[PDB]
């Protein structure tokens, strides 16, 4: 009956931002008390509702997205900003309601010497609307040219890896970020509160 958020947070594997994973979690009881009582969560953003009230104000439907990005822009993932990740990899809607959680996991993902196993879209044809996991891998172009699918003058791979190394600094350390998006409909609910 319990909502497997702790699954997502304590999940062994996380995806890259461009391939940000989505969970249509529902029909379970939520324990956000477990969430905001975490000592782990260095950052805890919430927009549209106090993390206090979620425990006892309950929703039609919820989405739990997750991905991995370098630490400092954790607040790029916010309601209505422009920027690298906001524009081309993940954009919350201006009228977004939900929360943003993250934490450092150098012990998990940082590897001595070299790691490059997380990706983010480097540049795209047009801005990304809210909520589209656009797994698009064809070589982006920026002009009048036959891309020919081959790198060169202008047409470039749209995705770029990371450099998560333990010997690097806190702003650049890999933070695993979970986005709790919320949605209400002209429909019955699926998640609610205790005692």
């Amino acid at each position, epitope marked *: 009956n319990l909502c497997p958020f702790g699954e997502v947070f304590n999940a062994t594997r996380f995806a890259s931002v461009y391939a940000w994973n989505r969970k249509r979690i529902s029909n379970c009881v939520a324990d956000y008390s477990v969430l905001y009582n975490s000592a782990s969560f260095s950052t805890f*953003k*919430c927009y549209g509702v106090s993390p206090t009230k979620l425990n006892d104000l309950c929703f039609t439907n919820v989405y739990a997205d997750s991905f991995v990005i370098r630490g400092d*822009e954790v607040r*790029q993932i916010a309601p*209505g900003q*422009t*920027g690298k990740i906001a524009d081309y990899n993940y954009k919350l809607p201006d009228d977004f309601t939900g929360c943003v959680i993250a934490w450092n996991s150098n012990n998990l993902d940082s590897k001595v010497g070299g790691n490059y196993n997380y990706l983010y879209r480097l540049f795209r044809k047009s801005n990304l609307k809210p909520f589209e996991r656009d797994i698009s891998t064809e070589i982006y172009q920026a002009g009048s040219t036959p891309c020919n699918g081959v790198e060169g003058f202008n047409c470039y791979f749209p995705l770029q890896s990371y450099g998560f190394q333990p010997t690097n600094g806190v702003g650049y350390q890999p933070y695993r970020v979970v986005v709790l998006s919320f949605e209400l409909l002209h429909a019955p609910a699926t998640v609610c509160g205790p005692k």
Partner: antibody
Amino acid sequence: QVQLVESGGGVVQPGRSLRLSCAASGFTFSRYAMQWVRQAPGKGLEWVAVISYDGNNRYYADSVKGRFTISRDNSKNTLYLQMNSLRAEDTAVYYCARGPPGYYDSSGYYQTPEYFQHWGQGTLVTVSS
Amino acid sequence: QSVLTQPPSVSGAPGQRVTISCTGSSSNIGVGYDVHWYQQFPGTVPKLLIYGNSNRPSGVPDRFSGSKSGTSASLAITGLQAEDEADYYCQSYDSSLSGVVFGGGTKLTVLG
């Protein structure tokens, strides 16, 4: 795209009350915390006041504490300023600004926005006798 | 608690890497609160430049890259050109009975 424009500025004698404002467009204005910031010419621009997304939470700088009134109508989709006990040094340009919405924090306490994304065009206040 | 200390102005050859620092108090920056830097041209609207300690919003093409330390912050203009000539403000929250603090103001200066 979002557009913010100020209005109501002018030359005012020190001491009397005044009403500034700023109209909003291009974004869900009702659910963003807004800010008013000061810039004396040639001097560093400084924060004046910040209004919660719902207008419930308000914060003024110390130098402007009490003398100033912030207000805003979600339905009207705009932001207002009420001026009491003006002073000459406050002759400056005033900017209405939008940043990321004020996130509620863990354990429930509100937090004001930490930075400003877009700005109004600006209004002038000349607190001069 | 204090105003974020800034240099008055700095200079650099066009297109080379230069830096601006910004220092704060324990209750100012080292408490954990982050910085952001704005620019504005003389007598113009202020525009945000780098809000994440090292992230760029759109229209901030490149050459702008922030940082973080224990108690100091820095932007590198890795390549400057007269379009960058403005004054730049380092803004960070304060936990000293205050809200957001704004830098004194630093002028970039290209060689004549």
